[model samples]
Target: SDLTFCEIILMEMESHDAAWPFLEPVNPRLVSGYRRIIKNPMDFSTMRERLLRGGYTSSEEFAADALLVFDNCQTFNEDDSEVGKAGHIMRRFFESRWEEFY
Candidate 1:
């Protein structure tokens, strides 16, 4: 999916403290890999490690918070896909966290 300009901006903002510039060309494969990681019904340790390695401390923090949000939001019959649910939670978490920085 094409990211919104605003989303791109937010993503960049979240990466400001990282070693590499966030505005550098983002690999489509990496994006897809993240999606797969989020959607897969598994613990997030590996995913978290990857984010840390990629200089996404903010993303990792937001995801940690998002997991709490996800647990609160879960319900029977909701049948939320692990990846999709986490993505939604992380988006909101990132947006909230972004406000603190900006």
Candidate 2:
């Protein structure tokens, strides 16, 4: 089965040890609960509705935090100017795709 966008995002975050900063801290129990939900591909309607009601404040905050990493990647690549091609690619990808998280 195809992964949902949430699953894809979680997978990408897990792929990078540093990416967890993009997620707001959840209560420990809630974190455990979400691990199960993420693993099981269950409906996220209730959570989605709650987030929508709150105007997706947490998501926007996390996106802002993650943008720092993107900005750093750009600066690193620009300063190096020759050997940081991967960072350049990452910076481009993040700038192009960052809105997807919000």
Candidate 3:
């Protein structure tokens, strides 16, 4: 039940247009120096992949990964920046839905 709920919320975020930058991992080559600062990179696809393979122990664990995506965004981009704004939008979406479900 928990992981299914996680998947539902995750898919909702994945479908968002603002989720573009976070759909996949950042390319180390295309975006030079990204890996240098953001040591641990997390994205929607990676999280979903893990979710499908039964990696998460609980909904709380899944939520941690979800929050990590936005946390990394805040670490790398300015609040006024595009990716940062998207992160805020996604986080708000996730939190509200999470509240409804959990």
Candidate 4:
């Protein structure tokens, strides 16, 4: 049986090397004021949990959460930072793959 497009895409994104920084939630203790600045923090682990829990009602909803991860990264980290560059690469990977589903 074939997997849903988003499921396949999620697996691919998680395996990407650039996805390292987003594999789990950012440690608020390690990064001070993180929760304050990023009100809606997201990560691969949370997305997967939501996906498994049937929390998302549509493909766009899944994409929205995925994009939110990168958006939050951009908001909290400078573009030149390692996490920021990873976010850029991971976001690009997600969008490029997402378009292929059309």
**lDDT of candidate 1 over 29-89, digit per residue (tens):** 7544444333323223333344445544454444544343334324211436553454454
Worst 10 residues of 1 by lDDT: 18-27
**C-alpha TM-score for every candidate:** 0.26, 0.36, 0.92, 0.93
Query: For each candidate, C-alpha RMSD in Å?
Result: 13.2, 12.6, 1.1, 1.8
Backbone clash tally (model 2): 0
Which regions in candidate 4 have their CA more than 4 angstroms from the true location? Answer: 1-3
User: How many pairs collide in each candidate, listed in order?
Assistant: 2, 0, 0, 0
- Model 2 lowest lDDT segment of ten: 37-46
Predict model 1's lDDT versus the native: 0.40
Q: Between candidates 1 and 2, which one is better according to TM-score?
A: 2
Worst 10 residues of 4 by lDDT: 1-10
Candidate with top TM-score is 4
Question: In terms of lDDT, which candidate is stronger, 3 or 4?
Answer: 4
Q: Which stretches of candidate 2 lie over 4 Å from their true place?
A: 1-7, 13-57, 79-83, 99-102
Ranking of all predicted structures according to lDDT, beginning with the best and ending with the worst: 4, 3, 2, 1
Ranking by TM-score: 4, 3, 2, 1
Q: Which candidate model has the greater TM-score, 1 or 3?
A: 3
**Root-mean-square deviation of candidate 2:** 12.6
Per-residue CA lDDT of model 3 for 1-102, tens digit only, reads 658788888889999878898999988898767889888889999998998888898998788888888888888888998878988888888889999997
